[PDB]
Design a protein around this ligand. Structure first.
Ligand SMILES: Cc1cc2nc3c(=O)[nH]c(=O)nc-3n(C[C@H](O)[C@H](O)[C@H](O)COP(=O)(O)OP(=O)(O)OC[C@H]3O[C@@H](n4cnc5c(N)ncnc54)[C@H](O)[C@@H]3O)c2cc1C
Ligand SMILES: Cc1cc2nc3c(=O)[nH]c(=O)nc-3n(C[C@H](O)[C@H](O)[C@H](O)COP(=O)(O)OP(=O)(O)OC[C@H]3O[C@@H](n4cnc5c(N)ncnc54)[C@H](O)[C@@H]3O)c2cc1C
Ligand SMILES: CC[n+]1c(-c2ccccc2)c2cc(N)ccc2c2ccc(N)cc21
Ligand SMILES: CC[n+]1c(-c2ccccc2)c2cc(N)ccc2c2ccc(N)cc21
Ligand SMILES: CC[n+]1c(-c2ccccc2)c2cc(N)ccc2c2ccc(N)cc21
Ligand SMILES: [Zn+2]
Ligand SMILES: [Zn+2]
Lengths: 230, 230
């Protein structure tokens, strides 16, 4: 009992398929008695740019600004901007982080990329040492819930788009695994725009049904073999 | 017939290693007699977020906002935000587009991701049909000039990050090839922060040197096999 979930949500439109997937997650996890928080990035006008405004007070080397170094140092000295530390608190408290987003150029929308760039700073999400299996968010679960324009068929190994697992690598391995997350199997809702109403409802139902047993899941082996291998 | 180059540059600090790579590109291409334009995204405070502010005309569906549909229609009608069409002019006139950036989470910094999201809209960069080899930017070249924190060794098949080509897939194939670009081989400058002053100087020089004969290069086969092997 007592699980905490953060949903990081990146869609402009409440009535969208993404919005529906987010709301189903909120309702079902809430029904289960979980603690639920939603970071609605567009509604928050979330800042995507990594800039020197992300550090308050004086820099550790204001002659040559290195964002990575400066945010590492600011994290240690508790002088990060409040929009960042607000998100870090939600992540720190969460047992599971769900990312809900439409696929933009085989990746996350820029507003969500900005969340990953700015929130997951050195000292908070990883360090030397402490990355991949020993990343600082170890013990936490992460799950990518992505919607696509392309159909399942268009996303095969030999297809024009390649296997969907190919585009997952930078997100699941390079970002989430790197920070110590155990990665649950992605939820891929293929081509809702093209799908019939029945097919759309079926995809929503699949998600809702999955959420009923999400705490019983095993994480994937987040390896190059899982992503590219046979 | 001389050549036109656009450099889309994503770093906050002029004195950075990325800044030096951008400046030597400008120096060398200028020396050759090329026409050179730089989009300095951080200096321009470039807007990364995909929002309804990107359309200024009457929305096709003002009760349910679909970013892709609305920007496609706005492109055709000429009612996109002018920061978008300003970038589109630079791309349209370019023979070669160089992207200069530090790797953020196996990808581009969010401010540059936003450039891709917002600038490469339907009708301008691709059509349905009219993508990959029939993409609308066919005839143009693109090149990623990337810097990393991780070492070359970490970015190998047996290294913990996997091969560097793995993370290039969403950018080179999912984005640039999809829009019709032919893709020149990536320039990856590994681990400058860790390297010595001389090694750093050497990496900048190697870039400058490659650029001398850039117009003689052939593009890569931007395929799953090139990226992932057999
Ligand atoms: C900049 C950009 C880059 C992109 N890059 C890619 C890419 O690389 N690869 C790719 O494949 N695609 C890409 N796309 C397409 C994009 O991924 C899809 O448009 C997106 O995933 C669709 O999801 P949505 O929530 O916006 O769908 P919506 O348009 O909101 O939903 C589809 C339909 O489902 C309906 N619906 C909503 N809720 C429910 C419900 N509860 N039950 C039943 N029906 C419901 C909606 O009303 C709508 O009619 C890109 C799009 C953009 C704008
Ligand atoms: C949010 C975030 C995510 C990241 N994700 C990843 C990731 O997934 N994978 C990864 O590998 N790395 C990652 N990194 C690390 C990042 O890619 C590196 O920090 C970046 O590439 C370093 O390049 P730079 O231009 O900032 O280096 P700088 O710090 O600017 O350069 C190093 C030194 O070179 C010096 N220099 C400048 N010009 C010259 C010159 N001409 N000759 C000699 N020396 C010169 C500078 O003064 C500086 O001291 C991430 C960093 C951040 C902040
Ligand atoms: C700039 C520090 N730094 C490094 C890094 C760079 C050089 C040497 C050691 C670590 C880094 C290296 C990898 N692979 C992945 C992510 C990051 C990173 C991420 C965020 C941040 N805020 C600083 C970060
Ligand atoms: C038009 C939607 N759409 C699709 C897409 C979805 C289904 C079928 C064909 C293409 C797409 C497919 C791939 N592989 C790569 C990028 C995009 C894309 C990119 C931007 C955008 N604004 C719309 C996009
Ligand atoms: C193991 C690679 N690696 C990293 C490193 C860089 C990015 C992410 C993780 C580690 C490193 C990071 C810092 N700050 C300082 C020295 C080293 C280093 C030094 C020697 C070596 N042989 C590998 C090294
Ligand atoms: Zn992994
Ligand atoms: Zn390709």
């Amino acid at each position: 009992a007592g699980k905490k979930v953060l949903i990081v949500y990146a869609h402009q439109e409440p009535k969208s398929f993404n919005g529906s997937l987010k709301n189903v997650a909120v309702d079902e996890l809430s029904r289960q008695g979980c603690t639920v928080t939603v970071s609605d990035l567009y509604a928050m006008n979330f800042e995507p740019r990594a800039t020197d405004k992300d550090i308050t007070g004086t820099l550790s080397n204001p002659e040559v600004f290195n964002y990575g170094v400066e945010t590492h140092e600011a994290y240690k000295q508790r002088s990060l901007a409040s929009d960042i530390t607000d998100e870090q608190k939600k992540v720190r408290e969460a047992d599971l982080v769900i990312f809900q987003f439409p696929l933009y150029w085989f990746s996350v929308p820029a507003i969500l990329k900005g969340w990953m760039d700015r929130v997951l700073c050195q000292g908070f999400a990883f360090d030397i040492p402490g990355f991949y299996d020993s990343g600082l968010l170890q013990g936490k679960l992460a799950l990518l819930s992505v919607t696509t324009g392309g159909t399942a068929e268009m996303y095969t190994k030999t297809g024009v788009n390649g296997d969907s697992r190919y585009f997952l690598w930078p997100l699941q391995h390079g970002t989430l695994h790197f920070c110590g997350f155990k990665v649950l199997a992605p939820q891929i809702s293929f081509a809702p725009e093209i799908a019939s109403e029945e097919e759309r409802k079926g995809m929503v139902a699949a998600w809702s049904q999955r959420l009923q047993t999400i705490w019983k899941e095993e994480p994937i082996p987040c390896t190059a073999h899982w992503h590219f291998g046979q």
